Structure formats: structure tokens, C-alpha cells
Short mmCIF file of C-alpha atoms and ligand atoms in Angstrom, two decimals:
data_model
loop_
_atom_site.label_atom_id
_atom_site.label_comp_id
_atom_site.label_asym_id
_atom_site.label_seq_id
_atom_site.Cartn_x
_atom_site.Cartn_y
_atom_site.Cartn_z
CA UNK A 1 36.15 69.20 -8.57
CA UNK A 2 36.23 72.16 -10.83
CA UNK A 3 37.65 75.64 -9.07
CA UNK A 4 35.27 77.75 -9.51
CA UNK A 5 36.41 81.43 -9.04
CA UNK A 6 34.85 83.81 -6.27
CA UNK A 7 32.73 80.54 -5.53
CA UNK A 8 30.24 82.00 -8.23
CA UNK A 9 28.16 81.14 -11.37
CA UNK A 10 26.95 83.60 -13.71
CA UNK A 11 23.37 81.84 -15.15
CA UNK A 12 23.74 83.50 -18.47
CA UNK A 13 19.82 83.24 -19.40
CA UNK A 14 20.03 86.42 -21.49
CA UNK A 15 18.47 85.92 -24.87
CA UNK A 16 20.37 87.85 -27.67
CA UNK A 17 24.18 87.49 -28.28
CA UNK A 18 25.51 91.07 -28.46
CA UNK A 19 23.88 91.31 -24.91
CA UNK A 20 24.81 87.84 -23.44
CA UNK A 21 28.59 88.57 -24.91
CA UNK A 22 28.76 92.07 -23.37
CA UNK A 23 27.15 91.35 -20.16
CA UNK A 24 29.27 87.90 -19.42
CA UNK A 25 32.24 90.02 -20.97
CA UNK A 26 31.93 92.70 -18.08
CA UNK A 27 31.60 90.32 -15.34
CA UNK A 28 34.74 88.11 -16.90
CA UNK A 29 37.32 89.09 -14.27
CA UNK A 30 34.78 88.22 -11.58
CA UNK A 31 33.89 84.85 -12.63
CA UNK A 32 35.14 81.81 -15.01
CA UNK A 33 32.46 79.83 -14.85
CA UNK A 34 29.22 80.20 -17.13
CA UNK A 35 25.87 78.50 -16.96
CA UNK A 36 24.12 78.36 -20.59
CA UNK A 37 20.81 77.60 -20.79
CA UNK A 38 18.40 77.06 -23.35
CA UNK A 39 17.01 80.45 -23.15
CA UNK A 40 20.75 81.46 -25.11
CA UNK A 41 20.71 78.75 -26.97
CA UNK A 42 17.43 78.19 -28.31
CA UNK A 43 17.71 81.72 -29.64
CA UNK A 44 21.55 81.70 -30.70
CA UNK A 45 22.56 77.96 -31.41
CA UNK A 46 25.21 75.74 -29.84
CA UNK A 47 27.66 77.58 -31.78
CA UNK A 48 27.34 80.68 -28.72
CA UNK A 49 29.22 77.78 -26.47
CA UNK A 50 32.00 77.92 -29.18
CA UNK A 51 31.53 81.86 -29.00
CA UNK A 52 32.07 81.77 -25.24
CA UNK A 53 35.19 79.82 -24.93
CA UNK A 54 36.63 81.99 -27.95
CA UNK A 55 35.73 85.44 -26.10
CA UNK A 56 36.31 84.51 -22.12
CA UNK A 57 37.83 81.23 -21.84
CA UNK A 58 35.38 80.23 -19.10
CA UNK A 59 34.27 77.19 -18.37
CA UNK A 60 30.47 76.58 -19.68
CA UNK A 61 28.06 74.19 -17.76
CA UNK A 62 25.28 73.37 -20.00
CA UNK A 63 22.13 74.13 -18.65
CA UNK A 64 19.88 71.41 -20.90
CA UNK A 65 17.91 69.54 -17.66
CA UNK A 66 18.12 66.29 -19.69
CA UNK A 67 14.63 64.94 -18.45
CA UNK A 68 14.36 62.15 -21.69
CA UNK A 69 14.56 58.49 -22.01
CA UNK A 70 17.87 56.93 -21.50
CA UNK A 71 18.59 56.74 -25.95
CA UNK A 72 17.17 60.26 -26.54
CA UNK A 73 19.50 61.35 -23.20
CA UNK A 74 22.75 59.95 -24.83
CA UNK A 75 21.97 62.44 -28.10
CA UNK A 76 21.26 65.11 -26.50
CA UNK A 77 24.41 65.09 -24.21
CA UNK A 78 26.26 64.12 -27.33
CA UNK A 79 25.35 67.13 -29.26
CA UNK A 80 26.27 69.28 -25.79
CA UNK A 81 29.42 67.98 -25.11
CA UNK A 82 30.48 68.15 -28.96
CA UNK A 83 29.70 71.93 -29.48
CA UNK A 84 32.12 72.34 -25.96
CA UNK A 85 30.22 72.22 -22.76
CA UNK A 86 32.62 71.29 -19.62
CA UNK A 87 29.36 69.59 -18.04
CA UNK A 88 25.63 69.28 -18.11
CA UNK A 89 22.86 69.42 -15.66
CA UNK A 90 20.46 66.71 -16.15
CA UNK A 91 17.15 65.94 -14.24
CA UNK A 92 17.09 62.98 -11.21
CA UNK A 93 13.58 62.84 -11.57
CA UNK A 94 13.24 60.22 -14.54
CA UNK A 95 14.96 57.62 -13.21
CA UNK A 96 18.27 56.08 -12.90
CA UNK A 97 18.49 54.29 -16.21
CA UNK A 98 18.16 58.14 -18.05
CA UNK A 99 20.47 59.46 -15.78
CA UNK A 100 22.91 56.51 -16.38
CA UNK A 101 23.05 57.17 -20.23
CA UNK A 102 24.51 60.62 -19.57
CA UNK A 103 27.09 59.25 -17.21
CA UNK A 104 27.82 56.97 -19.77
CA UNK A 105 28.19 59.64 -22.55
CA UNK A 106 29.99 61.88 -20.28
CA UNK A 107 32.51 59.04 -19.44
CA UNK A 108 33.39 58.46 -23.06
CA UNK A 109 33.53 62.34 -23.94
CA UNK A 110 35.74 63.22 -20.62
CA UNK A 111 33.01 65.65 -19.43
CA UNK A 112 30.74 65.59 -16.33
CA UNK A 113 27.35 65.36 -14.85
CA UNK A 114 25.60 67.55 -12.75
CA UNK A 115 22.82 66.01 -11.55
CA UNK A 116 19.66 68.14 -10.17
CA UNK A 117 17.96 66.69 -7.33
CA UNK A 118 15.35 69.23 -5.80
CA UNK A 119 14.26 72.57 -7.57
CA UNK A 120 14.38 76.13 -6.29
CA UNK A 121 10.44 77.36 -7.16
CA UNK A 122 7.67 76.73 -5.52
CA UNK A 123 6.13 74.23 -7.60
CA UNK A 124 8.87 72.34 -6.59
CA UNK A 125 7.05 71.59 -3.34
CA UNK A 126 4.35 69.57 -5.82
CA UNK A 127 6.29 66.26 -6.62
CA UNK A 128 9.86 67.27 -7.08
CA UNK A 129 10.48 67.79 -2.79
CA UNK A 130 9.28 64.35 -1.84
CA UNK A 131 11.82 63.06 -4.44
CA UNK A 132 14.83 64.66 -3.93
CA UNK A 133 16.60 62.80 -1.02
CA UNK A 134 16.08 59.88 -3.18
CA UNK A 135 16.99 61.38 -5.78
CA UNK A 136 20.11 61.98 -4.68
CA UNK A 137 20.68 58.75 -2.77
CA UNK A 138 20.50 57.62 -6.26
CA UNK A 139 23.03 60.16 -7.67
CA UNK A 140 25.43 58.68 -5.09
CA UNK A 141 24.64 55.38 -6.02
CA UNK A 142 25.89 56.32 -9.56
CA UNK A 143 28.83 57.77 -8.52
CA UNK A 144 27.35 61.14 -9.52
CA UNK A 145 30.05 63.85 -8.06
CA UNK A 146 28.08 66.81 -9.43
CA UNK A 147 24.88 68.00 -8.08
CA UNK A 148 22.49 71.11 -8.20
CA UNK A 149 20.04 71.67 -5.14
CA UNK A 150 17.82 75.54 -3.58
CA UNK A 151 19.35 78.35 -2.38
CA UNK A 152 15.15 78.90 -1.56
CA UNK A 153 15.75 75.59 1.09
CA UNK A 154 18.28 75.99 3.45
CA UNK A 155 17.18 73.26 5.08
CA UNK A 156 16.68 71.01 1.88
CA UNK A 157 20.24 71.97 0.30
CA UNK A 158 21.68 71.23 4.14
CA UNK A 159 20.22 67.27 3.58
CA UNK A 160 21.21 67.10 0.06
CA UNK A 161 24.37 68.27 1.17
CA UNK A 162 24.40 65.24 4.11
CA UNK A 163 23.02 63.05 1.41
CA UNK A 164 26.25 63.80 -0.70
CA UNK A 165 28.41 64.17 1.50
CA UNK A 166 31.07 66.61 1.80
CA UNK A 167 33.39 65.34 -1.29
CA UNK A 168 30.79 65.84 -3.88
CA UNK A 169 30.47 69.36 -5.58
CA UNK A 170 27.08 71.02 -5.39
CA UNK A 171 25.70 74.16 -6.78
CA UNK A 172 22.61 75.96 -5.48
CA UNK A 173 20.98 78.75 -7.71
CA UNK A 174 17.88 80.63 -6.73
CA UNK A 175 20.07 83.00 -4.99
CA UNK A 176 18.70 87.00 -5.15
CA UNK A 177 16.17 87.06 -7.60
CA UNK A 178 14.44 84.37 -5.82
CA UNK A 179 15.36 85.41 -2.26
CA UNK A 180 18.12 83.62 -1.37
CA UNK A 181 21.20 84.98 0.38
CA UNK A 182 24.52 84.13 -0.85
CA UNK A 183 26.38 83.91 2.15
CA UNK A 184 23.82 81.34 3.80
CA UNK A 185 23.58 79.11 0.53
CA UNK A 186 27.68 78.84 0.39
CA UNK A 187 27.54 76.88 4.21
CA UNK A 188 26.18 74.26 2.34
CA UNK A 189 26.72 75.18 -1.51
CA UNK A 190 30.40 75.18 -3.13
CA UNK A 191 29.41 77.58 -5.75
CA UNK A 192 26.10 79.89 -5.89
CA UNK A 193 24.49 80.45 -9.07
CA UNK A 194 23.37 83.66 -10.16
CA UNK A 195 21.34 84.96 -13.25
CA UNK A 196 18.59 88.07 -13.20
CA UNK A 197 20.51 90.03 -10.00
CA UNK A 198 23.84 90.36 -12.13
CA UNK A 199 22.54 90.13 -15.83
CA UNK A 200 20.03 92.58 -15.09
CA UNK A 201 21.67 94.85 -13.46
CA UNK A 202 22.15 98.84 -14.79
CA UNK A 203 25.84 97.44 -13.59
CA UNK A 204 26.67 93.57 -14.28
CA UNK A 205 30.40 94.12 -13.20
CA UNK A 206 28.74 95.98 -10.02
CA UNK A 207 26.47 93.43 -9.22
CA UNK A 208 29.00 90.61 -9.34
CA UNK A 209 31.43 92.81 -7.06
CA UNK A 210 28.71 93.74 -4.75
CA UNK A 211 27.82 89.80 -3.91
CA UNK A 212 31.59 88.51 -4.16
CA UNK A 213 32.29 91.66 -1.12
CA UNK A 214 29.44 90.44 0.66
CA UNK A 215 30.99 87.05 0.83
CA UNK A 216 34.78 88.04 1.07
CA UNK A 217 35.16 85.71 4.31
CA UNK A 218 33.69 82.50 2.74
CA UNK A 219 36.80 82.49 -0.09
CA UNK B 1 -5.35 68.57 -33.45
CA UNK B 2 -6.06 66.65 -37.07
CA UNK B 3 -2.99 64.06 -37.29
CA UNK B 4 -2.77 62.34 -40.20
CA UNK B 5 -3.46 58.61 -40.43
CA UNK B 6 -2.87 58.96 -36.64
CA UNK B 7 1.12 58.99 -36.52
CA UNK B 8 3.63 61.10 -35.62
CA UNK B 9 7.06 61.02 -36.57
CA UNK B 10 9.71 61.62 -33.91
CA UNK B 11 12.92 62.64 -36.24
CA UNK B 12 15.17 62.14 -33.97
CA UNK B 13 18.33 62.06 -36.52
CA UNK B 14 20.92 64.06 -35.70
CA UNK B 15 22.21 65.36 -39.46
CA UNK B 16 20.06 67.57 -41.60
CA UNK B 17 20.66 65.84 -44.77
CA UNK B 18 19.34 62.74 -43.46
CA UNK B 19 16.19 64.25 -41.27
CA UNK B 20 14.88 65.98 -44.26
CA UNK B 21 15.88 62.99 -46.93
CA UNK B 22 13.84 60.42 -44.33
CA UNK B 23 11.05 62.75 -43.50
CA UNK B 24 10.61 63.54 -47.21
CA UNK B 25 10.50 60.08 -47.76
CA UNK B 26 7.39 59.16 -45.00
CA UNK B 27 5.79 62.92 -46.10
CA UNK B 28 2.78 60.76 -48.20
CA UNK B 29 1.83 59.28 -44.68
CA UNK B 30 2.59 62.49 -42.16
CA UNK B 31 1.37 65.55 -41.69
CA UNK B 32 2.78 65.83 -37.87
CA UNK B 33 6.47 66.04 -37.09
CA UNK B 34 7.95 65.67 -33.33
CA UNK B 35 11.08 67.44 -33.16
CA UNK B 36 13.52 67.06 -30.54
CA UNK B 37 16.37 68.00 -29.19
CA UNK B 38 18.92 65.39 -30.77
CA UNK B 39 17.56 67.58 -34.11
CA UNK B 40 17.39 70.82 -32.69
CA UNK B 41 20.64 70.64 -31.12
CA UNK B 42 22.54 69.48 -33.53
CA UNK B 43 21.68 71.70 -36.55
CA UNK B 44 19.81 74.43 -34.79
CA UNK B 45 15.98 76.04 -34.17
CA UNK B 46 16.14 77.21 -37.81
CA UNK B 47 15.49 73.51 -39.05
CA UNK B 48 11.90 74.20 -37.62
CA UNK B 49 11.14 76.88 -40.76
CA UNK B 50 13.00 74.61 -42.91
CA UNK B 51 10.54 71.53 -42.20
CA UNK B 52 7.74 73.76 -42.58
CA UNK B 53 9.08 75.33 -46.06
CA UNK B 54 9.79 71.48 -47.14
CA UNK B 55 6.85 69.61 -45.93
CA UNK B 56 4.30 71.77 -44.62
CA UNK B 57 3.55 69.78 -41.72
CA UNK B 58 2.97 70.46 -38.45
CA UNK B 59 5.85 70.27 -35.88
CA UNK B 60 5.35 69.30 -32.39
CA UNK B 61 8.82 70.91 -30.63
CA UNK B 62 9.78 67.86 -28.16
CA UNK B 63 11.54 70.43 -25.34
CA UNK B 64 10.35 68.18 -22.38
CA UNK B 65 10.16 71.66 -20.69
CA UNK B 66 11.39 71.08 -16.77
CA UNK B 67 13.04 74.78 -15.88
CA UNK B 68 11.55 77.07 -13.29
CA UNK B 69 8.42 79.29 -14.75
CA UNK B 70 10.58 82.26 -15.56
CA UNK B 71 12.83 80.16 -17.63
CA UNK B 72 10.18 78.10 -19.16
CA UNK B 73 8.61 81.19 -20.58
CA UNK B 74 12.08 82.20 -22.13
CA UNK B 75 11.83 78.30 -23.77
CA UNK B 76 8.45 78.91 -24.72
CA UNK B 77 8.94 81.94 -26.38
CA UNK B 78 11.97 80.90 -28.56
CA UNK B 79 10.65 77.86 -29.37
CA UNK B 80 7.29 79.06 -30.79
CA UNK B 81 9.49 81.99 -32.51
CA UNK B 82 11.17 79.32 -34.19
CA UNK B 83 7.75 78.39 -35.85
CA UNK B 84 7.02 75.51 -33.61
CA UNK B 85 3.00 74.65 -33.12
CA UNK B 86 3.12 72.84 -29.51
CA UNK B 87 5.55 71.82 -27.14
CA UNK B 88 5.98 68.92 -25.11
CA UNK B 89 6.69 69.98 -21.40
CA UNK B 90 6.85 67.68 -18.04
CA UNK B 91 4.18 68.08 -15.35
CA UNK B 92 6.68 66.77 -12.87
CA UNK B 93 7.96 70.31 -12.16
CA UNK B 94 4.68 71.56 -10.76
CA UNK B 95 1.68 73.86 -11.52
CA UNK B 96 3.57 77.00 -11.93
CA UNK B 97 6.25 75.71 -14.38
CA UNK B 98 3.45 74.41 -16.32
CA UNK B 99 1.44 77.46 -16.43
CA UNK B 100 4.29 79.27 -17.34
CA UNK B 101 4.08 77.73 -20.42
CA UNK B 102 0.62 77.73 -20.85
CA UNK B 103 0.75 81.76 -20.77
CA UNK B 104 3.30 81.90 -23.41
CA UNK B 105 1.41 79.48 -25.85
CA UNK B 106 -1.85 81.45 -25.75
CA UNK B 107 -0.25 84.56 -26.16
CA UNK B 108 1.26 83.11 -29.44
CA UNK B 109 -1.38 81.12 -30.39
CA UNK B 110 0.10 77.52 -29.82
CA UNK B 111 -0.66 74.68 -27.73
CA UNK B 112 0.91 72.64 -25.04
CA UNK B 113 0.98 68.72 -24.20
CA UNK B 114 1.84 67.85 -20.74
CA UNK B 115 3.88 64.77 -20.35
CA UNK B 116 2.36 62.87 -17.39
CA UNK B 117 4.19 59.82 -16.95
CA UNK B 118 6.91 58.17 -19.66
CA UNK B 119 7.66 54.94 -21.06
CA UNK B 120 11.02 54.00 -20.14
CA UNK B 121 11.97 51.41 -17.13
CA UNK B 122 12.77 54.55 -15.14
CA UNK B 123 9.92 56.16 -15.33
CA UNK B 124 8.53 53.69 -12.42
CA UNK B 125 11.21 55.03 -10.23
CA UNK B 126 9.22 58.73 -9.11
CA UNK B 127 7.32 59.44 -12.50
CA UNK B 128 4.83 57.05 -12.06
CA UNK B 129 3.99 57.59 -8.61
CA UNK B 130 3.07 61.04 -9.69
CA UNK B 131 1.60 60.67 -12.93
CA UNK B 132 -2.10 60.36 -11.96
CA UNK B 133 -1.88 63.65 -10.18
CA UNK B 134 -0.04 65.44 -12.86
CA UNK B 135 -2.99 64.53 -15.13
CA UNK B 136 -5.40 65.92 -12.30
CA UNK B 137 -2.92 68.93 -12.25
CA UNK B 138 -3.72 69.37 -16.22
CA UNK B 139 -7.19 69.16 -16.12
CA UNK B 140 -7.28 71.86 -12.84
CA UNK B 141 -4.90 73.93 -15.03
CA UNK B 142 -7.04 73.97 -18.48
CA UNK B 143 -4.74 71.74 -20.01
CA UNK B 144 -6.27 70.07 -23.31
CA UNK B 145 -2.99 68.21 -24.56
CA UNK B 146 -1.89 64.91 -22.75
CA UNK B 147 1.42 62.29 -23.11
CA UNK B 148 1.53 59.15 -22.13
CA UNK B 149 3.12 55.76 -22.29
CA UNK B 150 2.77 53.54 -24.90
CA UNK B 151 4.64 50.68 -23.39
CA UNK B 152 2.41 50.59 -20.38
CA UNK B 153 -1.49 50.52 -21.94
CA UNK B 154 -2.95 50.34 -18.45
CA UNK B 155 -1.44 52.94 -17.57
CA UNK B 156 -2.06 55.21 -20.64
CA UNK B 157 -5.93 54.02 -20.29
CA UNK B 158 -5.91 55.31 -16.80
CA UNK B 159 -4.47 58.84 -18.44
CA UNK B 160 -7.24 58.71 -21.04
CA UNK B 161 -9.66 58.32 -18.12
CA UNK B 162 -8.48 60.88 -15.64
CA UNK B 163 -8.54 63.63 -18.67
CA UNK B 164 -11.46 62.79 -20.41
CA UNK B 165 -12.19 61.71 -24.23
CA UNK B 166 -12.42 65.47 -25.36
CA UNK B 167 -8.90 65.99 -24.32
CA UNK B 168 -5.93 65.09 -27.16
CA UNK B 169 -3.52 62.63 -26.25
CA UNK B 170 -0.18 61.30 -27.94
CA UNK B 171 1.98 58.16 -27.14
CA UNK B 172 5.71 57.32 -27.92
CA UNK B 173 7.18 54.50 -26.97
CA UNK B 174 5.45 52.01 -29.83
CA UNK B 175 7.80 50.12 -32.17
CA UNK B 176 11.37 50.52 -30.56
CA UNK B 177 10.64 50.32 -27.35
CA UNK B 178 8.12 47.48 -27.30
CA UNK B 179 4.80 49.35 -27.57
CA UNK B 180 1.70 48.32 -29.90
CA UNK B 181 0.59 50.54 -32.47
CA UNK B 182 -3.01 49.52 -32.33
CA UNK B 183 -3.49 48.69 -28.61
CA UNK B 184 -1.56 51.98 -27.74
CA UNK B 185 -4.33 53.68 -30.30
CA UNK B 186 -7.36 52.19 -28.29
CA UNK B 187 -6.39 55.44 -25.78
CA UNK B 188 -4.29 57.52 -27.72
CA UNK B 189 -5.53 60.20 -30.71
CA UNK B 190 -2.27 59.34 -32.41
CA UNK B 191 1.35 57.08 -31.69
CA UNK B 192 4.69 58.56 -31.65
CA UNK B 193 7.36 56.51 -33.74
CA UNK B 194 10.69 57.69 -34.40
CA UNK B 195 13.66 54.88 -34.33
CA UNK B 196 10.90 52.07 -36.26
CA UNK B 197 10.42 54.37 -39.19
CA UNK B 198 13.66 56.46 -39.44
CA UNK B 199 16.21 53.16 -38.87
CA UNK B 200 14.57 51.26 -41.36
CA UNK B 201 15.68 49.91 -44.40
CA UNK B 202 13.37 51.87 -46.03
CA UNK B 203 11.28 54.55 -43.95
CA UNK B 204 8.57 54.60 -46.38
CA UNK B 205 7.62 50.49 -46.65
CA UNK B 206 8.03 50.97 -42.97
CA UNK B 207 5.66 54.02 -42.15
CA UNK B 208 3.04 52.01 -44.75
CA UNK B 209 3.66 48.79 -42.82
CA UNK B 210 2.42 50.64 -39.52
CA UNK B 211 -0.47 52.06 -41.25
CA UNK B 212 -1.60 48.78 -42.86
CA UNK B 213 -1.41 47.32 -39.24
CA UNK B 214 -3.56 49.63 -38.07
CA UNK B 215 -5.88 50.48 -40.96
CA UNK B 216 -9.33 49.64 -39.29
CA UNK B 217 -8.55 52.36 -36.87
CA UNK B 218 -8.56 55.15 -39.30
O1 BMP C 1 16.17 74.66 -9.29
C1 BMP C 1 16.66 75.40 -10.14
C2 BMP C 1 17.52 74.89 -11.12
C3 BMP C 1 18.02 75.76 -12.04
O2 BMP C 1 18.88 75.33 -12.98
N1 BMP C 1 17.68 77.09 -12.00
C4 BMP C 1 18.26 77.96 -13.03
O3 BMP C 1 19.20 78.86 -12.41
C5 BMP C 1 19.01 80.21 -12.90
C6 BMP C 1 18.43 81.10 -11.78
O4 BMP C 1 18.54 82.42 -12.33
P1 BMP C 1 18.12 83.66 -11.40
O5 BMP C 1 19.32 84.04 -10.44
O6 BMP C 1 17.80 84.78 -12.49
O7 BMP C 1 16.92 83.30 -10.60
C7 BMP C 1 18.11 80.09 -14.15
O8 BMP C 1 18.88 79.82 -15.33
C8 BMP C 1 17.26 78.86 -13.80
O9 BMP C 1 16.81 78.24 -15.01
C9 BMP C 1 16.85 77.56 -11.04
O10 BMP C 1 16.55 78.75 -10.98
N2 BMP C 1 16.35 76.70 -10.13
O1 BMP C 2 7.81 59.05 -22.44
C1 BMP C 2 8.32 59.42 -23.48
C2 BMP C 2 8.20 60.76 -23.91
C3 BMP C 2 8.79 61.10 -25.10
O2 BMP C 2 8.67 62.36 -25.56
N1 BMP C 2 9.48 60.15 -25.81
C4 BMP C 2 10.09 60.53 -27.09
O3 BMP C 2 9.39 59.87 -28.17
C5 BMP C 2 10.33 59.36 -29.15
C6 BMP C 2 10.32 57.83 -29.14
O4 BMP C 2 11.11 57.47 -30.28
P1 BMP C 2 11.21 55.90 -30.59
O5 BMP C 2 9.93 55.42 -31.41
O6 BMP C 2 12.52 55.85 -31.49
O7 BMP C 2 11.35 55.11 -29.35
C7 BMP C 2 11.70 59.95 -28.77
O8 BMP C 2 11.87 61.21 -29.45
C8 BMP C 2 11.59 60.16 -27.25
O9 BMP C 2 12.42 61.24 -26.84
C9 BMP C 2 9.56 58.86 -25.38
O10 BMP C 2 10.14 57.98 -26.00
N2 BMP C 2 8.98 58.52 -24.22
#
């Protein structure tokens, strides 16, 4: 599984690339690992990936939430993987067929899946919930290694965790901005993820420190 | 929404040279463009202005929106900066994700379509289980825009139904994946086609072959 330093993810969701750049910058000797979402770029183009791994030499998971039919899945992933993306999240909830295109791609490329069984919001409690644990039976099933569950759930991300078991690598973001605490997502969590509380921040580099200290005894 | 001739192109090629060559070559028939993220991906957002510059058609941005509400706004926004009219987003995700978007687009003066249930083979797996409520969830939320299947008509009719005739409602999957143009327009306002037209041998003789089939409709 990848080694994620300090056991955190910076969800880069800023939306301009001087800001995104110095922000991610700042936190650099914090954290090597960088989630990228469409929010960056939508606004900035797949070429910020290339920008990323030029600047920091982190490792970028692609935040795309592939949620489209199994052809449409395999270009999308396609396009992610070629502009440099270590790995992609992609959506459970459409089935396994969609999910198994991306597996597919990511075989062929040599990049992974993350696959994202229950969601950290509270409209996630609509459809999403009663999903999940199949969800990720499913992901299993697949030989998915790589999934994303709530910081917001203890007690969901503890079952996805069982469902998974203790081999697979799982991320949980929701944490802070959304009320979760970082300590009590990592007993279940490998890495936390981590956007608005660090990127917002009057100090990013602050920020980071300030949740790393607060879980010195879980690294 | 005023779709021409009833069909929307999903240009779903991956090079801009070949997009705006294929789409140039259909423009006689379209007035409505889906564009998606194999597109938008691969030669960036700014290929939005360049359709409209080109063709002057409308462009339906195909984001299948699925993030949280705070991200979804932050979609939202850059997409409909990008010139985009509407944008596709899933129901699946709940109310608030959905009304996230719904915020955005009336602040900007655009529209959203809710997806509702799909047309692939997985789409049976948790999709449609959910569907009928998601449509429910629409019409609660003000929703005007639908999506359904066009490989499953019964299912699409049951859409229609749930939201009303007043409400708008597209369907991909004809062509390609197995779908009817004219049964899938009995329900739908308009069909999605992408891999049918822009795989052809010629686009064009293909987009007028669709049309023909369909002509008593218009
Ligand atoms: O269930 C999920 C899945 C996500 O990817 N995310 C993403 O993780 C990040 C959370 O950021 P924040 O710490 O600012 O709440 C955002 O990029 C969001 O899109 C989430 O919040 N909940
Ligand atoms: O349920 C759905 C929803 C979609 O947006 N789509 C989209 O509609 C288009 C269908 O293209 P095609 O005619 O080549 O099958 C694709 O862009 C796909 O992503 C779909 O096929 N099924």
C-alpha cells in the first residue's frame, strides 16, 4: 500500500493555482500525498497534476468520483492516469461492471483504484448508507485494495473497515471541517483526509503541524 | 429547453481536432451538445467557449456531479464559468448534494438535470432500487430537468410518470448500447447519442439516418 507520510492527505480543493501551489507548497514537508479534485482542475486543467509532481514530488490521488457507465469510465480514467495521477477515487454506487472498467484501465496503466463506498455528508444517509456494506463487499469481490469511507461514521468506517479487512488501505475524509476527529478516524482509517481546516487556514503549515502533534502516538 | 430535431450529441471523443471536425459535421441536425468528461479532460474546460464560438449550440456539461454539497458548488461554479448551460448531476448522493447544485445554477442562470437511474447492466445493482425515489426527491426539490434510461423504456416511462409531462427529460443509452430512438422518444423530450453518430463512417449520413427514423415524431 502506498506510505503515506504523517498518515495524512491534504484535499487540495482550492480553486486558483498561485494559491493551490503556495498553500500545498507550505504544507510540503508535512505531507506527500495530494488529493486533486475537480474543483482544481475544472478551473486549472489536468496539466496542474503535471504542475504538482514538478513543484513537490507528491504523490496525487485523483479526486474524479468516476460515477459513469463502464466505456465512458475507461476514458475518463484514461485521461487521469495519462496527465499523472498515482490513483483515482471512483464511485461503488453504479455497479460493478463501471467499477470493473477502471480496474481494468488501472491494471494496464500500473495505477490504482480507490474505491468509495459510503459518503461523509448527510445526504449520505438518503441512499448511499444502505449501500455501502455492499458496496464494499463488492470492492472485495474485485480485488479492490483501495477504499474511501466517513470520518462523520465511526461506526460506519469501523464496518467498512471489517468489511475490508485489515490488508486493504482505506482513507476517511470529513475530518475537521465536518466534525470529525483525527485521532478517532485513524483506529480505523490508514490515512485521514483533510481539505478546508489546513487550506484555509491564516497558517496551512500550522494547521498541518497542529493535527500531525495531536496524533504523534498513532505514527 | 428547445432541442433540435430532438437529439443530442454526446461528443465523447477524446482529441479536439476530431470533436470539432465530427460535431461540425452533424451541426445541420444539432443545436444541443453533451459534453463530458472524456472531452473535458482531455483538452480542457476551455473547449466549452470554443464549441460555442464554432457552433453556437447549446452545451449540456455531462459532470455526473456525486461530491459532497460544498464541493459540488465548487463544480458548479467552474463548470458554468466555463460557459456551460446545464449540468448533469446524480441524485444518488442525496438532497443536499443536489441542492447544492441547484443554488449555484440559479445564481448563474443555468439549469440542472438530475440523473435518476442509468442505462448500463450495473445500474440494477443499487441505482435502480433508488431511482423512483430520486425522481420523488427532484420533484420535492423543484427540480425541472430529468435523465433516464433509454435501454430500459419501462423504466424511463415510470420516470416520465413520477415527474410529470411539464418536466424535461433526456435519455442516453439509444444506438450503442441497444436503446430505440423512437420508443425511447415516446417518454423522453430528446435521445442522447454519442458512439452511433461520432464512430460512424460518416457522422452526418448517420445523424440523418436517426432523424429519418424518427421523422413522424418531430
Ligand atoms: O465522502 C466524502 C468523499 C470525499 O471525497 N470527500 C472529499 O474530501 C474533501 C473533504 O474536504 P474538507 O476537509 O474541506 O471537508 C473534499 O475534497 C471532498 O470533496 C468528502 O468530503 N466526503
Ligand atoms: O445513464 C447514462 C447516463 C449518461 O450520462 N450516459 C452518457 O450518455 C452517453 C452515451 O453515449 P453512447 O450513445 O455512445 O452510448 C455517454 O456520454 C454516457 O457517459 C449514459 O450512457 N448512460
Amino acid at each position: 500500500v502506498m506510505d503515506v507520510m504523517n498518515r495524512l492527505i491534504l484535499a487540495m480543493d482550492l480553486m486558483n493555482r498561485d494559491d493551490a501551489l503556495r498553500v500545498t507548497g507550505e504544507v510540503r514537508e508535512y505531507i506527500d500525498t495530494v488529493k486533486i479534485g475537480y474543483p482544481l482542475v475544472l478551473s486549472e486543467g489536468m496539466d496542474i497534476i503535471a504542475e504538482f509532481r514538478k513543484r513537490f514530488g507528491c504523490r496525487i490521488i485523483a479526486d474524479a468520483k468516476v460515477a459513469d457507465i463502464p466505456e465512458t469510465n475507461e476514458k475518463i480514467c484514461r485521461a487521469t492516469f495519462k496527465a499523472g495521477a498515482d490513483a483515482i477515487i471512483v464511485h461503488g454506487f453504479p455497479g460493478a461492471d463501471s467499477v470493473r472498467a477502471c480496474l481494468n484501465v488501472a491494471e494496464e496503466m500500473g495505477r490504482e483504484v480507490f474505491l468509495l463506498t459510503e459518503m461523509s455528508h448527510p445526504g449520505a444517509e438518503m441512499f448511499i448508507q444502505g449501500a455501502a456494506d455492499e458496496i464494499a463487499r463488492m470492492g472485495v469481490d474485485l480485488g479492490v485494495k483501495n477504499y474511501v469511507g466517513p470520518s462523520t461514521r465511526p461506526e460506519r468506517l469501523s464496518r467498512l473497515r471489517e468489511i475490508i479487512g485489515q490488508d486493504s488501505f482505506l482513507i476517511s475524509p470529513g475530518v475537521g471541517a465536518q466534525g470529525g476527529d483525527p485521532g478517532e478516524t485513524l483506529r480505523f482509517a490508514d490515512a485521514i483526509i483533510v481539505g478546508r481546516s489546513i487550506y484555509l487556514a491564516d497558517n496551512p503549515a500550522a494547521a498541518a503541524a497542529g493535527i500531525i502533534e495531536s496524533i504523534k502516538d498513532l505514527l
